[PDB]
Each structure stands twice: as C-alpha cells, then as structure tokens.
Design an enzyme around this catalytic site. Structure first.
Site, PDB file in Angstrom:
ATOM      1  CB  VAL A  59      -0.947   0.037   1.216  1.00  0.00           C
ATOM      2  CG1 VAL A  59      -1.806   1.295   1.181  1.00  0.00           C
ATOM      3  CG2 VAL A  59      -1.819  -1.207   1.249  1.00  0.00           C
ATOM      4  CE  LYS A  66      -7.561   5.363  -7.269  1.00  0.00           C
ATOM      5  NZ  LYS A  66      -6.108   5.465  -7.579  1.00  0.00           N
ATOM      6  CB  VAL A  97     -15.303 -15.497 -23.034  1.00  0.00           C
ATOM      7  CG1 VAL A  97     -15.299 -16.737 -23.920  1.00  0.00           C
ATOM      8  CG2 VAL A  97     -16.713 -14.969 -22.852  1.00  0.00           C
ATOM      9  NE  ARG A 143     -13.801 -22.468  -5.751  1.00  0.00           N
ATOM     10  CZ  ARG A 143     -12.672 -22.116  -6.361  1.00  0.00           C
ATOM     11  NH1 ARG A 143     -12.667 -21.126  -7.243  1.00  0.00           N
ATOM     12  NH2 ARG A 143     -11.544 -22.755  -6.087  1.00  0.00           N
ATOM     13  CG  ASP A 186      -3.360 -27.128 -12.763  1.00  0.00           C
ATOM     14  OD1 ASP A 186      -4.313 -26.592 -12.161  1.00  0.00           O
ATOM     15  OD2 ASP A 186      -2.732 -26.564 -13.684  1.00  0.00           O
TER      16      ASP A 186
HETATM   17  N1  LIG Z   1       0.118 -16.929 -13.073  1.00  0.00           N
HETATM   18  C1  LIG Z   1       0.379 -18.081 -12.544  1.00  0.00           C
HETATM   19  C2  LIG Z   1      -0.605 -19.025 -12.420  1.00  0.00           C
HETATM   20  C3  LIG Z   1      -0.335 -20.247 -11.873  1.00  0.00           C
HETATM   21  N2  LIG Z   1       0.938 -20.507 -11.449  1.00  0.00           N
HETATM   22  C4  LIG Z   1       1.195 -21.822 -10.881  1.00  0.00           C
HETATM   23  C5  LIG Z   1       0.726 -21.889  -9.523  1.00  0.00           C
HETATM   24  C6  LIG Z   1      -0.587 -22.371  -9.709  1.00  0.00           C
HETATM   25  O1  LIG Z   1      -0.807 -23.081  -8.610  1.00  0.00           O
HETATM   26  C7  LIG Z   1      -0.349 -23.287 -10.773  1.00  0.00           C
HETATM   27  C8  LIG Z   1      -1.623 -23.662 -11.486  1.00  0.00           C
HETATM   28  O2  LIG Z   1      -2.429 -22.581 -11.875  1.00  0.00           O
HETATM   29  P1  LIG Z   1      -3.962 -22.574 -11.632  1.00  0.00           P
HETATM   30  O3  LIG Z   1      -4.706 -23.707 -11.916  1.00  0.00           O
HETATM   31  O4  LIG Z   1      -4.442 -21.531 -12.400  1.00  0.00           O
HETATM   32  N3  LIG Z   1      -4.153 -22.078  -9.977  1.00  0.00           N
HETATM   33  P2  LIG Z   1      -4.529 -22.963  -8.917  1.00  0.00           P
HETATM   34  O5  LIG Z   1      -4.456 -24.300  -9.362  1.00  0.00           O
HETATM   35  O6  LIG Z   1      -3.657 -22.711  -7.891  1.00  0.00           O
HETATM   36  O7  LIG Z   1      -5.906 -22.609  -8.326  1.00  0.00           O
HETATM   37  P3  LIG Z   1      -7.180 -22.716  -9.071  1.00  0.00           P
HETATM   38  O8  LIG Z   1      -7.528 -21.841 -10.051  1.00  0.00           O
HETATM   39  O9  LIG Z   1      -7.134 -23.886  -9.786  1.00  0.00           O
HETATM   40  O10 LIG Z   1      -8.230 -22.976  -8.305  1.00  0.00           O
HETATM   41  O11 LIG Z   1       0.222 -22.461 -11.601  1.00  0.00           O
HETATM   42  C9  LIG Z   1       1.868 -19.580 -11.563  1.00  0.00           C
HETATM   43  O12 LIG Z   1       2.984 -19.813 -11.202  1.00  0.00           O
HETATM   44  N4  LIG Z   1       1.617 -18.366 -12.114  1.00  0.00           N
HETATM   45 MG   LIG Z   2      -5.718 -25.612 -10.515  1.00  0.00          MG
HETATM   46 MG   LIG Z   3      -4.767 -24.764 -14.045  1.00  0.00          MG
HETATM   47 NA    NA Z   4     -10.603 -14.550 -20.849  1.00  0.00          NA
HETATM   48 NA    NA Z   5       3.822   1.115   2.403  1.00  0.00          NA
END
Ligand SMILES: Nc1ccn([C@H]2C[C@H](O)[C@@H](COP(=O)(O)NP(=O)(O)OP(=O)(O)O)O2)c(=O)n1
Ligand SMILES: [Mg+2]
Ligand SMILES: [Mg+2]
Ligand code: NA
Ligand code: NA
Length: 327
Positions: A59, A66, A97, A143, A186
């Site tokens: 922050v 803000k 999407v 979910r 995953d």
């Molecule tokens: N931007 C990102 C997105 C994911 N990751 C790695 C950590 C995530 O746990 C892993 C898998 O991505 P993910 O499926 O989108 N997220 P995650 O499984 O943790 O939670 P959910 O969306 O599935 O619920 O990617 C990353 O390092 N950088």
């Molecule tokens: Mg995941």
């Molecule tokens: Mg994923």
């Molecule tokens: Na999108």
């Molecule tokens: Na700060």
DNA sequence: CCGACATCGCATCAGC
DNA sequence: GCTGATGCGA
DNA sequence: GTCGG
C-alpha cells in the site's frame, strides 16, 4: 482474520484491479491492487485512515488517497464512473470468456459486439479456443467440489497406468494444497524415457486414451509437452449431468520432477515470493531447475533434488506444507 | 525520475 | 513454404 | 501502483 473487516475497501481494490487488467491493459497495476487487497484483508483492525493503511507493504501513496475518499464518502468517484461506462464494462465482462483477452475484447466491443448474445451471433469472428470458452461459459466459472476432484483423479490415474505403468501422474494446483474446491484440474506427468537428456508420443497417448473413454471432450491447445482442454465426469444413469471442467496436462522431465511439483502446486503468489526471495539469497529457481547464483549472478549448474524441502533448504526457508502455500 | 515486478508452451498473426 | 511477433492463460 | 535504485 476477516473479509468483512475491511470488505468495503478490499472489494474496491479488487474491482480496480480487474479494470487495469482488462481495460487499461496494465498487468502490474492489476497485481499491485491485488497485493494491497490481500495484505489489507489480513489486517486484524478496522482501518480508520489512509495513513494507517499506507503502513502496510504493498500500500502506497495513491491507494492511501483512494482509501481516504472512500472512508469520508462511502464511494470512489473514479470507480463509480467506470462502472457506468458502457465500453469499459463491456470490455471487462467479455474477458470472462476463456480465449478472449483484453485485446480481442476491445476489438469486439469496438465493432459493436458487447454481450454473449452478440458473440453467439458472430461465430466466424471466433478462434477455436473462444468458441469453447463461450460454449462452456457458465461451467468454467463454476467451482469444482473436492469430491468431484477425487472422482476426476480416479479416472486420470486409472487410464494413465492403463497406457503404461511407468508413467507417474501427480494432480497439483489447489487440489494438492488440499482446498475444499478447485477452479480446474492440473495434472503433472512423467515417464522414465523422458529426461533432460532425450519414446516419441508420450503426451499424445495419454490424452488419446482419456478421449477414448470420453473423459476429455474438447481441446483448447496441445503439443509435445503441454495440453489444455475440457473434461467431464460420467453421469449416474438416473442422475443428471456434470459440468464440463477445465483440465491441463503437462509433461515434465523426470529428473526435474520435484521442482515442477513445487511450481504447479503453487500457489500463484507463493511462487512469486519464492523466486523473489531466491534472488536475494543468491539463488534463482524456475519450474525446472534451482541453480546456485554466482557472485554477479552467473548461475551455476542444476543441483540435485529428491524432495520438495530440498529446495526449501537451498533457499533456507521453513518447510511449509502445500496447505500453507497460498502465499 | 525511472525500470522491475518471471517465464513458460501453444494458437494465430505479421511478414520475408 | 518458412521464421518471428503477439496474444493468451497459466 | 509500489518499491527501491
Ligand atoms: N500466473 C500463474 C498461475 C499459476 N501458477 C502456478 C501456480 C498455480 O498453482 C499453478 C496452477 O495454476 P492454476 O490452476 O491456475 N491455480 P490454482 O491451481 O492454484 O488454483 P485454481 O484456479 O485452480 O483454483 O500455476 C503460476 O505460477 N503463475
Ligand atoms: Mg488448478
Ligand atoms: Mg490450471
Ligand atoms: Na478470458
Ligand atoms: Na507502504
């Protein structure tokens, strides 16, 4: 310990975050607002001033300003205005999407296309990924209960060994961090005849098998080392159908297996804080190999690792279990 | 006052 | 035909 | 937008 404590503020920053990402196209402001929202969400007091919030890391000056406005009025004028702007709200929504990013969303909205209805009218203007994200718009935002994940894991683990019993498949992501629900699935994959050294169609045959038994239904993208698609649990004969779910399968060399488990288990922010903290402790880690930095940072060779806390020691942190890796 | 905030694989576009 | 740039989601 | 060079 509370969403409700500074919920008015943390919602404000979350909204501001989405508009930077999707409309202003600034991924780091999106990240900055999220960071601010996060640390404020864990703050165990009800914030009374912007100066009070500025104390927290993440922050700074502007977000402090803000907060002052919100506290003394109950609204944020910049946010109120951007909420009621047709173009900005349409661009933002369309990015929900899968396949449609800020660029395409801005493109569609410019030529008058602003809703799902308009999208479903203009299929010629959609790549294959987008047609599927549109098709399963609702389901992809649902979910996945952990019960279904376990059911999903069953089918995957079964068909993997059915192809070749030398495969290892590890379900990572939030599921492995033990979460009660996940957004997707995953799958990490490995086979002895694939290392950082050198069997041709390793990923194809697993995917081909999962399609055979009608688990995987659609393909967003697929290559040698990575697959992105859609899958579905088969329904009980009387009972209704399950939602289509997002699934990613990735093929990682076996000799680098654990660094991959660490990374794809996550979480998101956690990986950013580990690789930001390796660079201060004379290391540099990615999804493949932790390498000991040199003095100016000349990156040594890929170390050995045969468990996840091997990595935690190199980097010198306390070994947190997956359930404690949200940040 | 100014750059880093990580980098990846795969689909698709720009262009020789 | 090709290589490289970009968009996208992770 | 925030942090630090
Ligand atoms: N931007 C990102 C997105 C994911 N990751 C790695 C950590 C995530 O746990 C892993 C898998 O991505 P993910 O499926 O989108 N997220 P995650 O499984 O943790 O939670 P959910 O969306 O599935 O619920 O990617 C990353 O390092 N950088
Ligand atoms: Mg995941
Ligand atoms: Mg994923
Ligand atoms: Na999108
Ligand atoms: Na700060």
């Amino acid at each position: 310990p509370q969403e409700t404590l500074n919920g008015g503020i943390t919602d404000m920053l979350t909204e501001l975050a989405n508009f930077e990402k999707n409309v202003s196209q600034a991924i780091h402001k999106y990240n900055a607002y999220r960071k601010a929202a996060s640390v404020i969400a864990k703050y165990p007091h009800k914030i009374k001033s912007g100066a009070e919030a500025k104390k927290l890391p993440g922050v700074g000056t502007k977000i402090a300003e803000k907060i002052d406005e919100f506290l003394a009025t109950g609204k944020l004028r910049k946010l109120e205005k951007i909420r009621q702007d047709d173009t900005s709200s349409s661009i933002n929504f369309l990015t929900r999407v899968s396949g449609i990013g800020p660029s395409a969303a801005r493109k569609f909205v410019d030529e008058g296309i602003k809703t799902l209805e308009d999208l479903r009218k203009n299929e010629d203007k959609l790549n294959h990924h987008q047609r599927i994200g549109l098709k399963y718009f609702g389901d992809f935002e649902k979910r996945i209960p952990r019960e279904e994940m376990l059911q999903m894991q069953d089918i995957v683990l079964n068909e993997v060994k059915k192809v070749d019993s030398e495969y290892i498949a590890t379900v990572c992501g939030s599921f492995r961090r033990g979460a009660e629900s996940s957004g997707d699935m995953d799958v990490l994959l490995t086979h002895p005849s694939f290392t950082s050294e050198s069997q041709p169609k390793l990923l194809h045959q697993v995917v081909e098998q999962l399609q055979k038994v009608h688990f995987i239904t659609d393909t967003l993208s697929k290559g040698e080392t990575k697959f992105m698609g859609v899958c579905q649990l088969p329904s009980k004969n009387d009972e209704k159908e399950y939602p289509h779910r997002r699934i990613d399968i990735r093929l990682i060399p076996k000799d680098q297996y654990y660094c991959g488990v660490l990374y794809f288990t996550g979480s998101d922010i956690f990986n950013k804080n580990m690789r930001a903290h390796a660079l201060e402790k004379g290391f540099t880690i990615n999804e493949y190999t932790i390498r000991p930095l040199g003095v100016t940072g000349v990156a040594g060779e890929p170390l050995p690792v045969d468990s996840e806390k091997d990595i935690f020691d190199y980097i010198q942190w306390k070994y947190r279990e997956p359930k404690d890796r949200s940040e």
